[model samples]
Target: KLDIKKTFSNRSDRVKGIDFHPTEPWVLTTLYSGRVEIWNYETQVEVRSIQVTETPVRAGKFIARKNWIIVGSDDFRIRVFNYNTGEKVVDFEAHPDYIRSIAVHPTKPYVLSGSDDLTVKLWNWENNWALEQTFEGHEHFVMCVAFNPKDPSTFASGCLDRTVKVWSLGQSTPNFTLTTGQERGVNYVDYYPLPDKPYMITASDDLTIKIWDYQTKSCVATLEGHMSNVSFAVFHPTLPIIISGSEDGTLKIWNSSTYKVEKTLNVGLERSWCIATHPTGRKNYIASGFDNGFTVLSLG
Candidate 1:
C-alpha cells in the first residue's frame, strides 16, 4: 500500500487531528489532552508544543501563511496561536458544544468550523477571525467541513444526521443535501481535489468509504474494506488513489478513478483517526493520526 517514511509516537493521549506545514518539514498534531504539538519529521524531534487547554483539542491546522495554528477544543472554544513562539493570538467561545472539524481555505483567508451543535460557521482570518457567516441545516451533530478546493465560495459539511450538506456563504441554508445512508453516521467528508470533478467522498461509522457525484447528488461508489469505523479518507491530489484510515487499525489505498481496492496496511498502530497530505499540493507524503500516536508514509 505505502512505505513508512517517518514515525512519531505518543502514548499519553489519543490524537484527534493532524496537519502538515505548508513549507516546513514538520507536522502538527492535536491531542485529547489539549496538547497541540508540532514535530520535525525529518529529525524525529518535537519542535514545539502550544498548550491549548486541559480538555480535548479536537482539531488543529497550520495556517502557516499567517504563521499560526487554529485549534478547536471540546471545551467549546476555538483558539489561534502563533506557531513560531507558541503565543496565544486569540480565543473565543465558538460553539455551545464540541468543535469537531476545521477546514482551511486553499487561497482565501477563510476557515470553516463544524460543531456538534448542528451548525457550521465561516471565519475570515484576514479580518482577525471575524464571524463572517453561520450555516445551520443538519439534523444532528455536524461532523466535518471541507472547502471545495476548486471553488472557495462553495463547501461541504457532513453530519451525524446521515446527511451531507453543500453550502454557500451568501445563504443561511444549505444549497443542497445528500443522504449518505451511512447506517451509522458520517465522520468526515472531502471533495475531489482536482478541477471540474463534481465529486466528493464521505468516511462513515459503517466502515465504508463512499464516493458521490455532487451534480446529481448520487452515489458513485461504495468502497468497503475497513473492519471498523472509517475515520478518515481522501483522494490524493496528484496520485491516482484514495487512502482511508480506520478504527480497525489499518490504512487502505484504492484506485483513484475506478474505486477498486489497491492496497491495505496496518503498521501496528491502535486506531487511525485522521490523515493529512503535503500542503504544497504535489508531494506524495501523508501523515496519519492514531489513537496512540501518528505515522508518516510515502506512496510508491
Candidate 2:
C-alpha cells in the first residue's frame, strides 16, 4: 500500500527538517544551507521560500492557527515569519551556541527551545516575544524538546547528557529523569498524539527507540534493530503508528500499540536525517529529508 507520490528538491545547500501544515496541504522545510521553503504537497510545487537569518535551520514547524512559521537554527537564532509574506516578524539570538530544536505550544502562545548550550528557554510567543524563563541543569547539550498536545504547561526534553526530562514550567526543575545508556545521549524525544494513551517516546544514538508510560514513569518497550544511529522518530497524528529514520538509510514504520514493525522503506543509500507528519490528516503520509539537499516519501 506504499508508493512514491512525488519527490521535492531541498533546493537549499542541504535539508535538515520537514513538517506539514495543519490546515493546508503544504509542507514546511528547514535547510542546513540556511533557508526555509514551503511546498504545496498536492501540486508538487514550491509555494514560498525564506532565507534564514544567517545560519542553517536545524528545526522548524508551522503554527497551525496563527498562520505563522517558527524555526531555530545553527545561527543561534530563533525566528518567526508571516506564512505568506516571508517577512520576518520576530528574530532573536537566545542561545549561546547552535540552537538544535524548537516547539510551539499547541494552543497557548508559549515557545520552548533546546540548544547545544545545555538550556531550555521559555518565551512568550506573542506580544513582542519576551523570554519568560530559562530551564537549566543539563550536563551536556540539549538535543530536542517537545510540548504535550493536551497540556501546554507540560513538556519533555532530551539531551546529550544521556537523559530525557519531563518538565512542568511552573516548577524550577524537571520532575523526573528517564535515562538511556550512559555512553550516548538522546537524539530526539516526542509525545505521540494519542493523548489518552499518555505515552512518551524517544530516539537515541544507541540505535533504539523506547516508549514509556507518562503517568506511571515506567519503561514500556524498546524498539530495536537500526544498523546505525537513529536520528528522528515521530508518530502519526491520527493513526496508531510510529515512523523513524536512521543513518542506516531506511525509514521504518511501527505499530505503536504492539511495537511491531509495520513496514520498511529503503530510501536508497543516502541516510534520512529528519522526519515529520502532516499536522492535519490521517492518511498515513510522511516526509523524510536526507543529509543531501533532497526529500522524498510516500503517502497512503
Candidate 3:
C-alpha cells in the first residue's frame, strides 16, 4: 500500500513531464506552458524554473552524472541545460517532427528519442550529443523509448503503429519485434527492472497495460482496470507491485506476481501526462505531471 505524501497543486499550468532526481529530494516538472521547474519536494520550494519554449516541453530527465537537465520540446529539438546554472549548453534539431519522448541511458553517455516522424534516434552525449543512429521501422509515430534495465546495449520503442520493437547499440535496425496482439496504440513501454529481467510492460490506448516475455516474444499477462487511456504503467523497482496512471484520474497498484489490482489511488490534478519514481528506489516517491500541476506520493 502507498500513502499521499505531497502534491504540487500550483494549477499554474498543465504539466507534460515530471521526473525525480536519482538520489535527491528534487523532482523536475516540464509544463505545457513552456517552462520547466525543479522543486525540492522536501522543502516544498522551487529550486529552479526556466521558460523553455512557446511549444510544449514533452519530456525531461536529469543526467545526474553530468548534473544536466535534458528535455524534448514540440519544436522537434533536444536541449540540454546545466542543472546548477540553467544555461543552455546543447541544442539541436533532433527530428523533423514533434518530439514525444527523451530517455537518458542508465549508465552510459547516451540518450534515445521517439518522435512523430516514425523513427527513434540515439544520441551520444559523450561526443557532444551527436546523432548516432536512427532506428526506423515503426509504421506510425513513435511515442516512447526506454533502455533495458539489465543491459545498456539495447532498448525498446513503443509506437502509435500498434507495435513495440527492441533495438540494440551499434545496430541500425531492431534486434527483434514484440508481438502482443494489441491493435491499440502503445503510449509507453519499459523493461521490468528485476532478476526476472526479460519481461516488459506497455501502457496502451485500450485502457490496459500488458506484460510480455521478451525472450520468448509473447504476451504473458494483460491488466485492465482504468476507465480511460492508460498513459503510463510501470513496475516498482524493488517491490512486487505495478503502478499505472490513466486519464481516468487514478493510479492503480497491481500485484506483479498475480496480475491483480491491489489498490487504486484517486489522487490526481487530472489528465496526467507522465509519472516518475526515484532511480534508487529508496525514498518511495511517486510523482505525476498532470493537466493542472503535479502530484507526489510516498509508498510505505
Candidate 4:
C-alpha cells in the first residue's frame, strides 16, 4: 500500500499530464485548461507557472542535465523553458494537429514528439532544436511516447491507431509495430528502467496494461484491474514496480516482475489521468494527478 504524504491543486480543470525531473525533487504538470507549472516538491510550492497556449497543454518533461523543460500543447507546438530562470528558451511548430506527448532522449541531445498528425518528429536539441527527422506510419493520433533508458537510439510511441511502434534514431521508418487485436487505442507506452531487459509496457483505453519483450516483439504479460480507461502507466526509477492511473479514479501499483497488483488507491477523484515518480533516492515517493487535484505519496 501507499500512504499520502502531501497534495497540491490550484486549477479549475483536470491535471491531465505530469513529469518528474531526472535528478531533482521537482514535478511538472500540464493542465487541461492551458497551463503548465513547475513545482518544488520538497518545499511544497509551485516555482513557476507558464501559460503555454489558449488550448490545453497536453504533456511536459524536464531535461535535468540541461536545466530545460519542454511542453506540448493542443495548439500544435512545443515550448522549452529554463526552469531556474523562468524564461522561455525555445518555441517551435511541431505538428499539424494537437501535440499529444513529448519525450527527451535519456542520453542524447534529441527530443521526440508524437501528435494528432499521426507522425513522430525527432529534434536535435543540441543543434538549436533543429528538426532532424520525421517518422510516419500510424493512421491516427499518437497519444504517448517514451525513450528507452538503456538504449539512447531507440524509443516507442503508442497511438489512437490501435498500435505501438518502436523507432530507431538512424531510421525514418519504424523497426516494429505491435498490435494485440484489441478494440481500443493505446494511450501510453514506456520502457522498463533497466537497459538490458528490453521490455516495454503500455496502458490502453481497453482497460488493461501490457508488458512487451522488445527484442522478440511479443506480449509478455497483461495486467487487468482498472475499471475504466487506464490512462497512464510508468516504471519506477529503480524498483521492479509499475504505477498506473486510470479514468476509473484510482491508482494501482504492480510488481513489474510478477505482474500482480500490489495495492490500489482510490483518491475520490473522478479521473486519475497522470502519474510520475521522482528519480532521486526516494524510490517510494510518487505523484499523481486527478480530475480535482494531485497527490504526493510514499509507498509503504
lDDT of each: 0.86, 0.80, 0.86, 0.82
Candidate 2 global CA lDDT score: 0.80
Clashing pairs in 4: none
Q: What ordering of candidates by TM-score runs from best to worst?
A: 3, 1, 4, 2
Candidate 4 per-residue lDDT over residues 1-300, each given as its tens digit: 445554444443678778777667777888888887788777878888888788888888888888888888888888989998988898888887998888887677888999999889999987998989999899998988887778768888899888999888879888889885445989999877766687888898899898888888788889999999999887887767888999999999899889899888887767998888876637477888778867777664
- Model 2 clash count equals 0
Error of 2 at 289 (Å): 1.3
lDDT of 1 by residue, 24-52 (tens): 88889999888888898778888888678
lDDT per residue, candidate 3, 1-300, as tens digits?
A: 555555444665888888899777899999887899999888889989899899999889998888899999989889999988879989899998989889988788899999999999989987878989999889998989999878879899999888899998898788998765667899999878986568999999888899998888878899988999888988888778888998988888899999999988776577767888877775577888778788877786
Evaluated with TM-score, which candidate comes out highest?
Answer: 3
**lDDT score for residue 158 of model 3:** 94
Instruction: Please give the range of 10 consecutive residues that has the lowest summed lDDT in model 2.
Output: 3-12
Task: Quote the lDDT for 129 in model 3.
Answer: 81
Q: What TM-score fits each model?
A: 0.95, 0.92, 0.96, 0.93
User: For model 3, how big is the CA root-mean-square deviation?
Assistant: 1.4
Q: In candidate 1, which residue ranges exceed 4 Å CA deviation?
A: 1-12, 281-283
Scored against the true structure, residue 202 in model 4 reaches a CA lDDT of 87
Q: Candidate 2 lDDT, tens digit per residue, 27-46?
A: 88898778888888678788
